[PDB]
Write a protein that binds this ligand. Structure first.
Ligand code: ANP
Ligand code: CL
Ligand code: MG
Ligand code: MG
Length: 378
């Protein structure tokens, strides 16, 4: 019975398994190789993953996301106090722990962040069991390098609630290095840079690996910079375009903005492999259809300042590690936003043409490495 690797991300999660000498990343029921970290509560059902994210515009008060931003924290944590201003669901205080309060089956209910994350993990466990044909009981689960003991405990709790024996909680940059086999070196220091740009967060880690032992030399980044911010630049662009073609400002209509946002996220993904993308939204605002298009070059202009901003944390990490650009042996791309061609060009140019490790889909590389480690531990 194989153990699984699970990357429990802020915006998406991913599961892999190592068997028959290789990793497979497991697609969900819809064929998607990652699954939104979303849970929705209705009058009759609990929805998780794609089904929950697909109805967010219809049920914003009872659709929970961003639980990783709360997990293991106190209610009075300044991070919790700040983040809650921007969520459409209610957060409450229960013994200085935060809980998310929703309507579910006609009653008011509240859940700890680890309970929300346990539902995401249950879905990832079910995705793996559908592929394998038998129940999964052991897993390695990943966390950010900055997580403290309480955040690590609550993540482990989420896994046990989901019915997994948690073999280990390991750092995301460590898992990404394992995916590329960077910890097999032997005697000799290797300096590795992990550049992780996800849906909601940006993390740079510099690791020194010596005889299979990992040392974090420096970390940098921005906890509120990710693909969602690129989506938002596209939304604002199309809001201005809809004003031109229809004389109407749709920005105060919550429904229309959320649906435009979903369409922008899809067009953005297309622009990673095509030079143009079409937007086709029926009945966007006031029954009016919105059909338009955008080029990859225009998208890069709209985000040029955000893309460029990722290089300053790299410079800072190198200064803190007391390393020059040329001393970094391997550059590893992690996170779905590193699939954007312009982001790859900026990092490669900054490193004066060095190779990028990107042969594993960047949004899957952490789960890939977690699955390898789970097999090693078993
Ligand atoms: N091909 C693609 N091109 C561009 N963006 C993409 C692509 N595929 C996925 N994304 C984006 O990548 C983001 C999700 O990355 P992912 O690494 O899966 O999230 P995560 O694991 O939750 N990381 P984080 O939110 O920072 O904790 C979303 O903004 C997606 O829209
Ligand atoms: Cl599914
Ligand atoms: Mg992830
Ligand atoms: Mg992160």
């Amino acid at each position: 019975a194989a153990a699984i690797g699970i990357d429990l991300g802020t915006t998406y999660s991913c599961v892999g398994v190592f068997q028959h000498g290789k990793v497979e990343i497991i697609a969900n029921d819809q064929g998607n190789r990652t699954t939104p970290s979303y849970v929705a509560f209705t009058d009759t059902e609990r929805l998780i993953g794609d089904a929950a994210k697909n109805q967010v515009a219809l049920n914003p008060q009872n659709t929970v996301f961003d639980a990783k931003r709360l997990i293991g924290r106190k209610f009075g944590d300044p991070v919790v106090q700040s983040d809650m201003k921007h969520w459409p669901f209610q957060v409450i205080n229960d013994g200085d722990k935060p809980k998310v309060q929703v309507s579910y089956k006609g009653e008011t209910k509240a859940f700890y962040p680890e309970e929300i994350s346990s539902m995401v993990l249950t879905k990832m466990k079910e995705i793996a069991e559908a592929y394998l044909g038998y129940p999964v009981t052991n897993a390695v689960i990943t966390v950010p390098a900055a997580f403290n003991d309480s955040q690590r405990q609550a993540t482990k709790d989420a896994g046990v609630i989901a019915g997994l024996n948690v073999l280990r909680i390991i750092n995301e940059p460590t898992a990404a290095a394992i995916a590329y086999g960077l910890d097999r070196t032997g005697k000799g220091e290797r300096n590795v840079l992990i550049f992780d740009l996800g849906g909601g967060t940006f993390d740079v880690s510099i690791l020194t690996i010596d005889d299979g032992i990992f040392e974090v030399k420096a970390t940098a980044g921005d906890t509120h910079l990710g693909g969602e911010d690129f989506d938002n630049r596209l939304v604002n662009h199309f809001v201005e375009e809809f004003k031109r073609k229809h004389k109407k400002d749709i920005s105060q209509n919550k429904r229309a903005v959320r649906r435009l946002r979903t369409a922008c996220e899809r067009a953005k993904r297309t622009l990673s492999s095509s030079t143009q993308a079409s937007l086709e939204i029926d009945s966007l605002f006031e029954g009016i259809d919105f059909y338009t298009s955008i080029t990859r070059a225009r998208f890069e202009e709209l985000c040029s300042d955000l893309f460029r901003s990722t290089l300053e944390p790299v410079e800072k990490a190198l200064r803190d590690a007391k390393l020059d650009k040329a001393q970094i042996h391997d550059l590893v791309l992690v996170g779905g936003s590193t699939r954007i061609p312009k982001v790859q060009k900026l990092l490669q140019d900054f490193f004066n043409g060095r190779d990028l490790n990107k042969s594993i889909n960047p949004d899957e590389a952490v789960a890939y490495g977690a699955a390898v480690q789970a097999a090693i531990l078993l």
